[PDB]
Ligand binder design. Sequence first.
Ligand SMILES: CS(=O)(=O)c1cccc(Nc2nccc(-c3sc(N4CCOCC4)nc3-c3cccc(NS(=O)(=O)c4c(F)cccc4F)c3)n2)c1
Ligand SMILES: CS(=O)(=O)c1cccc(Nc2nccc(-c3sc(N4CCOCC4)nc3-c3cccc(NS(=O)(=O)c4c(F)cccc4F)c3)n2)c1
Lengths: 255, 274
Amino acid sequence: ALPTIPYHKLADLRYLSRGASGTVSSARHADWRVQVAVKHLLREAEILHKARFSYILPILGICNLGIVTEYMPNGSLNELLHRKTEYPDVAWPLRFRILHEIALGVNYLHNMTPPLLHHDLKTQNILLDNEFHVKIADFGTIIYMPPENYASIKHDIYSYAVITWEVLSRKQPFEDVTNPLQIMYSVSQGHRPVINEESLPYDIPHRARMISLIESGWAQNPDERPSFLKCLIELEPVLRTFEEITFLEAVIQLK
Amino acid sequence: SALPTIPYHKLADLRYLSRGASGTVSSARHADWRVQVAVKHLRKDVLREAEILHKARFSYILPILGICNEPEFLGIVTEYMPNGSLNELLHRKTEYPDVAWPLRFRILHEIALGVNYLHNMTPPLLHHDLKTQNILLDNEFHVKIADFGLGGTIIYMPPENYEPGQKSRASIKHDIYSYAVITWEVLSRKQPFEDVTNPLQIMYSVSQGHRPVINEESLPYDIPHRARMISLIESGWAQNPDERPSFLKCLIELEPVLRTFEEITFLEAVIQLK
Ligand SMILES: CS(=O)(=O)c1cccc(Nc2nccc(-c3sc(N4CCOCC4)nc3-c3cccc(NS(=O)(=O)c4c(F)cccc4F)c3)n2)c1
Ligand SMILES: CS(=O)(=O)c1cccc(Nc2nccc(-c3sc(N4CCOCC4)nc3-c3cccc(NS(=O)(=O)c4c(F)cccc4F)c3)n2)c1
């Protein structure tokens, strides 16, 4: 049973971001005494109360039309990666925890009955909680879209491989390509964000393995791309090489 | 709004945590989800209780991840809280010599935010067994309330519940009494009614009017906002249920005390435990 929130309970309302999916605004719940987020514009809402896991954005209720969720104080992964002035240093332990937690969230979705596929994964909708843990949300840009999409369980892995490339480089994929149709043409032809020392330096922990994960993930042939299970099996040994305190020290470095 | 069914064999690396009245608690890993979980080993009565608790969608309430519906055993699968309970933080002074005031106040504010949410549900969800053993701590030491009262300690029980019935079990002012004892225990790192040898003796002292010692040895003068804290404690552990405040009035009181602490001080407090 999904609770019903009356619009008058959502005080201090302030727009966060717009979008085709709906307009998103922050607000403070008068009775709960916490910040929430509301998305203006019912059957799919219950389908998203079934999508309940540690790395999926938690839905708190329904406005009778808006969807109330938790407020992610640290915005999106896009901001963290590309606001190099606010964040000049983003340590590897945290970048690897983000990548691990994205794969966990997507894997849970794919493991539902029926398998729920996101099909719109992008750094913009990889949200960050107060401790910089990932919450997947938002079930214009094409840099994350597989070429065959210009209905497939191999869509999200393509998006994931691009996001991984971006997390590890802090570069905008197809940086020098202004026209999105020119990106779409280079991708249809099997060209991908560049892998070299300028984009992906040698100082990256487990560099070779990450490269092979990225390259297999963004493969032209959908069937040659891994499942999130194979991809999580590859990631588990990498994450084990980081001591718990290094993630905490990585976050404190951002504050 | 569906609660998934988890096949017991999908749970790898099972390891015993604690045996309690409610059942046995173990830490496992879901082979499909690739995450550690906690499984509480305890049919139609249980699936209804699980859905009642499944309604609680709040940051400071322990999330239920699924039910283990085996013909042999019946289990509840929740998120695994890696830092155990508030009790271990408070009393394992060897493992945790220093527990900074910002973390202590963050814990109390989240306990109060958790309970208030439950009391605000329709119909209200009353805990009625709040104790420091069932306030669990996540990886970043944020609170998750667990072990709802559908051989344990009496030290958080209001005197009027001692001989229970219709009024005591439907009482709103039970949870706030337990909160005042937790608050007192949090600021002191002292076992309430430590000196008293018998839990039965504790029961007499309380029913008469005695409470754990609000002095200098227990509560130092260095305690931030010592005044408003001692006020709140005393008000919440009042003999007259009517004289106890709501969790909302308790939050309103707490909020400015929390604004006093800079964000980074909570992070520093955690690095200090770890
Ligand atoms: C400027 S920003 O928008 O990046 C930003 C800055 C600072 C803070 C936040 N905080 C925040 N907190 C909670 C949610 C959100 C956002 S941001 C966003 N934007 C989306 C597009 O890119 C810009 C960010 N979409 C949401 C959002 C809000 C509610 C629901 C959903 N997605 S969903 O509809 O699929 C959904 C449910 F309805 C229910 C349960 C889970 C679930 F995923 C998203 N942002 C934000
Ligand atoms: C030694 S310890 O048990 O304190 C310990 C040490 C290290 C780690 C953990 N981790 C952990 N993680 C999650 C839950 C739990 C515990 S500890 C505990 N103990 C009982 C109290 O005494 C201490 C140990 N009870 C639980 C517990 C497990 C599942 C459910 C519940 N509560 S509930 O059944 O009321 C329930 C639901 F069924 C569904 C949703 C919410 C909900 F609360 C509790 N422990 C633990």
